[PDB]
């Protein structure tokens, strides 16, 4: 039975590959070769936020593009007011091995988790005035690698035990569980409609999941190594991915195949983060070689570089308004370029 | 816009309070020593932590030696693929690697050697030092003193190896026991001395699961590490 099932699976995979190849009528670069190049864009750092004792592992911009949140391994989660650089809150974490953070769209809660296998939801608007642990979600069996808010009462979490989960914060129990991956899940990205999402899990495959139906829909297998960062395209019909092979890729949800790849011969370091711009024309990617690159999403030519950091770049993020782009790095600083 | 100035003053006051708290926290955080305990499950690391103490994904143990604070982290309830979360421990002072010497027949000693090599040559862990505990010495002595388990069967080079001249055997050991012990130690040192960078070193130790000096050893080792780094900065070493 095992041999027969394996052979049938191989035949089905061959059928899938043939079907995908049938649609490859033309390449994106050939079609986009006529549009005008962006040229050269030199962004400059307008701020520098200091106060972290150790390196920085995560950050999430606010919905209003004025506050932001950062997490570090000194057991500290700090909320900055970007415009003036004055700190608003410094929550201390129970566990110092924090690997992710998130900021709710309503601005009333903050989430954080890590090696302790738990996701903590903190309240920022208690009447007493002190930040208190609102909830603790403790149903996973591996380190939490990414988490995002759907609303003030639903949170989607990704862990290293190869299964994602959708949690109802009020009850504290997994409303749904998503399974099908083989390796650790690393990244995550909610769709603009909050109806789907994607995830890349360290086996060179990114799966597209349906939140309400609770099951996988499509899989993309273009990469060669672990996938560290994933982002949804503004329109909602494509997504960009980055892995340890030092190459970024753009997949399309409808055509169901890779569209283009961004890479260069002189770059041999893995990508740690990826994010689009408001228009979707630019693609910013943070690397391990201490500087982050800015690619033209249609021409695939290196358009710009940001080189203000001196250590690994671990987190990157564009605002909702497209005003600026923030980056954190293992040197314990946060820079805001614009 | 007097309200703007009022809220700006309140913001400045909040910033000052947070800055004071962070200064205190930095003071406390700079004077605490973090250690990562690692080793195979079959090894005696469990008894080691139990002696030092006298569903979560990580366990913490805090102890004091001569009014110095050590925090030891033990990783449990995690899967067996270490290539991702290990990177979170690239700031610890030392990695206490516990390996059971009387493990050779699966062949566990070779697996321990491969794990040690992988940790040693990692990109983010090239500045960290390893304190190597060759635990379970009594079992090895009993096994080698009279038995049919030949180290030569699994390690042919053992047939051509003689004890180093600068060997300090414990009074009472048969020459074969010392020969086996030092063969294993040198096997572990071959990997450690190959890199040649000089940024980190290894500190081998012969320990039993019930030894009461282990704590002290860690303490002493820690000091050496620091000293050496300072002596490297001032061009003295």
């Amino acid at each position: 039975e095992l041999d027969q099932l394996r052979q049938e699976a191989e035949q089905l995979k061959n059928q899938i590959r043939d079907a995908r190849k049938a649609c490859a009528d033309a390449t994106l670069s050939q079609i986009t070769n006529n549009i005008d190049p962006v040229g050269r864009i030199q962004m400059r750092t307008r701020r520098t936020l200091r106060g972290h004792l150790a390196k920085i592992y995560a950050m999430h911009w606010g919905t209003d593009s004025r506050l932001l949140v950062s997490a570090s391994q000194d057991g500290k989660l700090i909320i900055w007011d970007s415009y003036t650089t004055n700190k608003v809150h410094a929550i201390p974490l129970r566990s110092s091995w924090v690997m992710t953070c998130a900021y709710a769209p309503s601005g009333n809660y903050v989430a954080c988790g890590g090696l302790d296998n738990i996701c903590s939801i903190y309240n920022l608007k208690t009447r007493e005035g002190n930040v208190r642990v609102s909830r603790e979600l403790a149903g996973h069996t591996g380190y939490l690698s990414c988490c995002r808010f759907l609303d003030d009462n639903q949170i989607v979490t990704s862990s290293g035990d190869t299964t994602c989960a959708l949690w109802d914060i009020e009850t504290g129990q997994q409303t749904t569980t998503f399974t099908g991956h083989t390796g650790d899940v690393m990244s995550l990205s909610l769709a603009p409609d909050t109806r789907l999402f994607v995830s890349g899990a360290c086996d060179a495959s990114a799966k597209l999941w349906d939140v309400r139906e609770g099951m996988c829909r499509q899989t993309f297998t273009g990469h060669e190594s672990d996938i560290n960062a994933i982002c949804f395209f503004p329109n909602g019909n494509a997504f960009a991915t980055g892995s340890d092979d030092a190459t970024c890729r753009l997949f399309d949800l409808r055509a169901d195949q890779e569209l283009m790849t961004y890479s260069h011969d002189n770059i041999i370091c893995g990508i740690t983060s990826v994010s689009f711009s408001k228009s979707g024309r630019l693609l910013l990617a943070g690397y391990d070689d201490f500087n982050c690159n800015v690619w033209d999403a249609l021409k695939a030519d290196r358009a710009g570089v940001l080189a203000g950091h001196d250590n690994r770049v671990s987190c990157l993020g564009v605002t909702d308004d497209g005003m600026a782009v923030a980056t954190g790095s293992w040197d314990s600083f946060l820079k805001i370029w614009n | 816009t007097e309200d703007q100035r009022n809220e700006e003053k309140a913001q400045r006051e909040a910033n000052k309070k947070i800055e004071k708290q962070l200064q205190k926290d930095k003071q406390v955080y700079r004077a605490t020593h973090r250690l990562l305990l690692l080793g195979a499950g079959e090894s005696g690391k469990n008894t080691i932590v139990k002696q030092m103490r006298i569903t979560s994904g990580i366990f913490e143990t805090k102890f004091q030696v001569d009014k110095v604070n050590f925090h030891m982290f033990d990783v449990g309830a995690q899967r067996d693929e270490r290539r991702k979360w290990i990177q979170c421990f690239n700031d610890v002072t030392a990695i206490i690697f516990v390996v059971a010497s009387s493990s050779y027949n699966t062949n566990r000693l070779q697996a321990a050697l491969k794990l040690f090599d992988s940790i040693w040559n990692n990109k983010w862990l090239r500045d960290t030092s390893v304190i190597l505990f060759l635990n379970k010495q009594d079992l090895l002595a009993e096994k080698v003193l009279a038995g049919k388990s030949k180290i030569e069967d699994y390690f042919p080079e053992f047939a051509r190896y003689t004890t180093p001249e600068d060997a300090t055997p414990e009074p009472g050991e048969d020459p074969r026991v010392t020969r086996a012990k030092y063969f294993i130690r040198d096997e572990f040192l071959r990997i450690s001395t190959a890199s040649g960078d000089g940024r980190h070193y290894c500190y081998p130790h012969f320990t039993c699961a019930v030894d009461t000096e282990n704590i002290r050893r860690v303490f002493n080792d820690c000091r050496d590490i620091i000293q050496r780094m300072h002596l490297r900065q001032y061009e003295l070493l």
Partner: nanobody, 128 residues
Framework: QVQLQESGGGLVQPGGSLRLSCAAS????????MNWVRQAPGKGLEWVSDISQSGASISYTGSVKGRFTISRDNAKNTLYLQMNSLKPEDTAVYYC?????????????????????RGQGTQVTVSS
């Protein structure tokens, strides 16, 4: 998609010789260190040997030293393990594994759980 396929195996009488081959596709072959591991019945995975990108550095396990040999052909992206003077304890399933990331010499590719970058394997049995 990373694809690894093992070939060569079967039944051999003690004292014979055998050759195992591993074909790889879906990634740049020349940039990854590779190795051969094995699993015997009732036992977990064991590490058999490894070879670097260009073949300069080669390593074997103690029990195998002086018997097997590992080579890699980057022109056609293949890996070869030549074994001779077999013994009954060599009966096992052999797997062709690859290190996770390129341009590095660290490796974590023996994990008992599903490792995403190893092939299905080939069965080799040595008996009278």
């Amino acid at each position: 998609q990373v694809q690894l396929q093992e070939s060569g195996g079967g039944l051999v009488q003690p004292g014979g010789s055998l050759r195992l081959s591993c074909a790889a596709s879906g990634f740049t072959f020349s940039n990854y260190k590779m190795n051969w591991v094995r699993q015997a019945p009732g036992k977990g995975l064991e590490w058999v040997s490894d070879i670097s990108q260009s073949g300069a550095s080669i390593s074997y396990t103690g029990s195998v030293k002086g018997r097997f040999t590992i080579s890699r052909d980057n022109a056609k992206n293949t890996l070869y393990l030549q074994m001779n003077s077999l013994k009954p304890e060599d009966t096992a399933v052999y797997y062709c594994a690859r290190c996770p990331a390129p341009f590095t010499r660290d490796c974590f590719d023996v994990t008992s759980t599903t490792y995403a970058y190893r092939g299905q394997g080939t069965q080799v049995t040595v008996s009278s």
